[PDB]
Point group: D3
Chain length 290, copies 6
């Protein structure tokens, strides 16, 4: 028995709504700024579940049972008696502080405020609030990845970290406590990997398929690092590298100028059909250095 | 085809099985003492008897593998070798005079390759009469499918192709690398371990947590702290210091935490304590 | 001598007492609102009444000090000023147009000085008709004996000497500085605080311990963590980021720990919590 | 009631011997490699105490009472039933590992092994030993400075840190626990100060007396940073900077090339009569830039 | 061919000279304030007068090229070269304001020093290319030809031919910060400034060192004053911000001098004070 | 004056030429293997022959200077210039072995590229000074005069006069890593190598870029091959180790080529392969 409000209806918010609604006994309020943005979010969840039922990987009764626990709307209307708030709205500081300042008046006092952000300070987002702000960081696709990073901020009490811990296990996830530093644990290790694999390309050491092949056969990684960057989106890798550099001031985390030149040109990876690989119609991918 | 493997230690052992696994090849497993090489082949043959009893290899395929390997001294066994893969102690002067000696023994068409991970292929073969290429296996060499082929600054393109063709002819996937510090795998993978240690050092997360986050967040088979324990923190410290010294770039500065643990003998699995304590059962316990 | 002090805040207050303390000087304490400047002088006069009751100043020396200071607007009080010390909000465009306005008011021989710590003296006075020098007091300006005199890239040697002579004429010790980021004191002293924080961040010692070690090991009056609390961690973060941005050098990267505490409002004494909790008695407690 | 053996009879060892022998109830074995090196150490302690009695700052009975508790000799002869060993021998790794490997056989099992080193790893010094090695770091003059840094190594148990804690209070010092990192607490903060004050000189920002005057009047420090470097010895500042750089790999701790050029020329500060200041006969010091 | 130059400063003026001195080309010269865009064409006749006087040019040739330059015109050019201020939104906006104004099929080229070509041309209808001239653009034989990720080869090659058509040498260079010449030459100026700042030598010694020790036509500090110390700071900063590498941090002595307006030859005081005698004096005497 | 040069390589040979070509000086040329120290004087007559053939020198002048050079002699010189290998203990030992051999009052000078002068002369009886020539020492007009902390002015000035006496220009420079010219010029070669390594351009383009874009007599990569890529690596490494600043990290492509013995003109293959035709080919074609 839990009510969960999810502020943001793009990719992350829809997956976070699905992660709670998969557990029987949870109802999800899928909110956004315009009521029609939330409705497009719930239709996107529905459309996506129609594909799996087709590909035979989920039963239609389950899909229906998931969709039935999600309600689109506005936070003023749906988040009063919410037990947990998980925001996955746009990565802008002032938008977050506004959202949470409103919800602070809307929500009952018992409500837990959490943010899925990966680029901003949990500490600075929840500064003015009347209650603890915590980080509850999901990984795309949030309904299938079992990791949750629980980020403590400078003032986030330990009970608040402990509660998000219990909730993550309740929904079948594995929490990992992180004290707020840029990149947390997973992003701080993983994106500098992608960045090194790009320096190795830029410096002429090896080719794209070779760097990826070496990482797949040499370390038993599921993808190559450059494959992976296309699939994450090179724009997001660049932004994480730049966040890792600006927070620390450490030249160690400088982004590879090759990534920046591709993002400038719009070659963001799988989402643009072209990054280090070209994604064609016939389901084949070829590295851009051929 | 006849291959000479210089070094009867673990790597040399694994490289000899890789070539002897394949029908039609012969391997001379050499080391600096006739006995060393004969102990190398005895470790190989008993690893094969555990496999036979485990039922995962025919008793006659294993015998035919052991039969294809001959221990001895290079002065006796490598003159009509077609390919030499060196896998001996990582010291630049020991590798240079081993390849100086082999330059006089081995027939001209014999190809010279070194399994080195941390020394410069180019420097290795500076003064020789024939090209020197990198042929960097991954342990266990008989089981890992990747082979990094390292072109030196004067290693002709023809030499690099023929080592590619040999790697596939023994069932590997060659990835051509133009020599730089760390090649591909080590240059990505060891700074990874190093970063997880800085995360531990700086109080961001705990050892178990850093490792759980990378396997459940990034789909990695091992956490980076378990893996640096499995590779050996001494191997990880040394690769970091190579990257640092070959580049000049503070980016590759090793994490002082790893340097403190290596100074105390806490190297990982090989000493029974690193980031994890490895107990008498099978569990491992984070020192956290 | 007649001095104009631009800014009736704490620094401007402390700089006006420094000049009015000395017999024969007059000070115009100006700010952008007539009331602000009159509140500045009222804070000054009541600080002097606590001193009189504490018996540490004659009742007539204090009255004569307060009498030498006149609040108002610069357009009214600074035209026949001999020296202008600006001490207003640290924003480059606010300082440039304040000195543009004063360039038309003040008689030509009036000397223009700014108390800025983080902005470029040279940029401050780029387009003016007269030189612009740094005259950087230390709070409390009336009590600290040091004055850093900052030569700009176009500040003549004659201007620098005359500010030296004024500093001693009001009983200070001038230390000539050729403009660079941090001058002398801030460039040594704030990286100090920053380093003690990295030591805390990296788990080397504890907050009380870092502070006790520096006072009993180096003969320092305050620990560096107490001192960053007393200066304000926001002031310390900002100086770090100036040093970093003016140099380009990772050496002066601020410690992320200090950046996290500033984002949470834990700035030190001014907010009642930083590295120390400051309780209702007089004790302070390390957040450690 | 405590017996203390001090391995090293130069400056540090003599001051460490004096710090324990000042406390009634402690007897000090002042050891070195050649019996005559320890005797010169005890005569140096005696000569130095004859000066204070002259300058009127200590009573002669006290000096005599201190000297009487110090015995020069060889560790084989004097350190068997020692309660604590504090080595302040030369800063060389192999010398330390040899000294401690011998003392490990000499000393009773109850004996605490400690090292005053400031440049080497406590962890690497006591690796092969049969008992914990700890760092007990004194500050010249060890008999008058109240700070002791107690350094835990990678394997130094907490009881061993706790015991050196009690002993430091017993002798009137204030211990500070430090987990082993280069420079500990005091040196990592202080010498990079001296180094910055030297960059400021080298870059032409201010003059020698001005940098020192600013630091004395601006921060209320007892000395200027350049004054202080002369008094510490610029060779030692250089070595600490170089140790801080090599251990971290961080360009942040690069030594100022001005310090290195003065050390090369032999201008080590007060001990050579010339560093940033020239130390004349008539008790006056003038900065070398005049 | 018709050619429009955007910017009327040293480089704008020199790029205009470079096109108009080849028989057959016509140039449109432009700037913000028109009085500055005629001040441009004014500095062009003034210099051609001093050379015809010195016998280096025939008056009729000097008069044939200053008649091919029109201060404005851009509606009909076959090629646009912007030599505007080295600020990114400054270049997007101009080029933004410019995709309307020019004929549909006319080539857009920027003379930027180190900025990404690819970001410069993002909202445009047509490919954007890099065509980099070197001070003085009318004498220096080099053109660096920089193509962005979305720059076709027909345009890269159409620039190579135009280059050889006006007596230049076009070297093609891939898009990275500083391209070739500035990435090498500007840190060299920056280093010489650190050498003066740390007192290793004086301004005079460093410059004659590199002239007599390296056979360089200018010392690195005279060369900074001639380039403009504000352009040098910019490129250093762009170098530093593109790579993230403290290797390229500008020398604080150059940031101090740009803040004071000691920019070199354009303001009469850089590392040298330039006198009417035509003699320059190092500011450290 | 009598002059002894220590080292018989390019710089040793050129420094010998620089003294002997001035009427009145005599030089003693030296090296490890004597066959190398006559190989030195062999490369000196061979080059003077090719110039007399090309009419640049009169045979009698070529014959007057090769008669002032004696392969050895050092016992009586008034001035010693070492141009030995750029390894510190290599220079201390030589100079160590040399304070005995030379006359008591003779001036000791090192042609080191970046090493501290002050540490070079520590155990010596006499001041040690820096007298830095530039390849080719007989043409390049510059001498950098470097004094150590314990080098008196009489010796610094005695070098300045000797310099002007052999038609050079002596610039005095304070002891820091790289002095002036190499601290600027060598990272410039190093940068051009990073530019080739990151693929921004090819070897040819970078060099003609800097010739046509900067008016440089050699491109930075030809200049590396002419200096020797082993000397360039050394100076970069010394730069990096003296400052501690990753700004000066050598480019790994130059460390790889030195490891392979691709040193430039002295080994026939650097960034260019040098052919008997007298044409050089970039190794990337
Ligand atoms: C920052 C960026 O983005 C790109 C950049 O700009 S980086 C900087 C690139 N530019 C440079 O580095 C400049 C390098 N410096 C040089 O090449 C030389 O300094 C230099 C060519 C400018 C030297 O000046 P110079 O040789 O005296 O001028 P130059 O025109 O070549 O020859 C001088 C002659 O102008 C000659 N001349 C003949 N015709 C001429 C003409 N049409 N126009 C001008 N001059 C002419 C005359 O012969 C005059 O010499 P005399 O008085 O002795 O007769
Ligand atoms: C690393 C360190 O520690 C210090 C260093 O060395 S750093 C590197 C410093 N050195 C440099 O940078 C070199 C810079 N490069 C240059 O200055 C030019 O490359 C260069 C002078 C070498 C160009 O070569 P050049 O101009 O062709 O040779 P140069 O001798 O000056 O003139 C060529 C002429 O030799 C001339 N010549 C006349 N007399 C001569 C003589 N006594 N000796 C030699 N050449 C003579 C001839 O005129 C020949 O030219 P022609 O065939 O056209 O008639």
């Amino acid at each position: 028995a839990m009510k969960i409000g999810v502020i943001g209806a793009g990719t992350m918010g829809q997956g976070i709504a699905k992660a709670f609604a998969q557990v029987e006994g949870n109802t999800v309020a899928l909110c956004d700024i315009k009521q029609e943005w939330a409705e497009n979010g719930l239709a996107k969840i529905k459309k996506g579940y129609e594909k799996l039922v087709a590909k035979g990987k989920i039963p239609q009764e389950k899909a229906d049972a998931i969709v039935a626990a999600i309600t689109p709307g506005l936070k003023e209307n749906l988040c009063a008696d919410c037990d947990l708030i998980v925001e996955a709205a746009f990565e802008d500081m002032k938008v977050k502080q506004t959202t949470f300042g409103e919800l602070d008046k809307i929500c009952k006092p018992e409500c837990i405020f959490a943010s899925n952000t990966a680029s901003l300070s949990i500490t600075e987002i929840g500064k003015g609030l009347s209650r603890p702000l915590v980080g509850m960081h999901f990984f795309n696709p949030a309904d299938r990845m079992k990791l949750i990073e629980v980020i403590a901020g400078c003032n986030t009490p330990a009970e608040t970290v402990e509660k998000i811990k219990e909730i993550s296990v309740a929904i079948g996830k594995n929490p990992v406590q992180v004290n707020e530093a840029a990149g947390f644990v997973v992003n701080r290790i993983l994106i500098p990997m992608i960045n090194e694999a790009a320096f190795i390309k830029m410096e002429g050491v090896s080719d794209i398929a070779g760097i990826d092949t070496a990482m797949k056969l040499g370390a038993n990684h599921p993808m190559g690092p450059l494959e992976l960057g296309d699939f994450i989106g090179l724009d997001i890798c660049l932004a994480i590298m730049d966040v890792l550099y600006h927070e620390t001031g450490d030249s160690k985390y400088r982004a590879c100028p090759l990534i920046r030149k591709m993002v400038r040109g719009g070659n963001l990876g799988c989402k643009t059909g072209k990054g280090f690989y070209v994604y064609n119609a016939d389901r084949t991918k070829t590295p851009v250095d051929n």
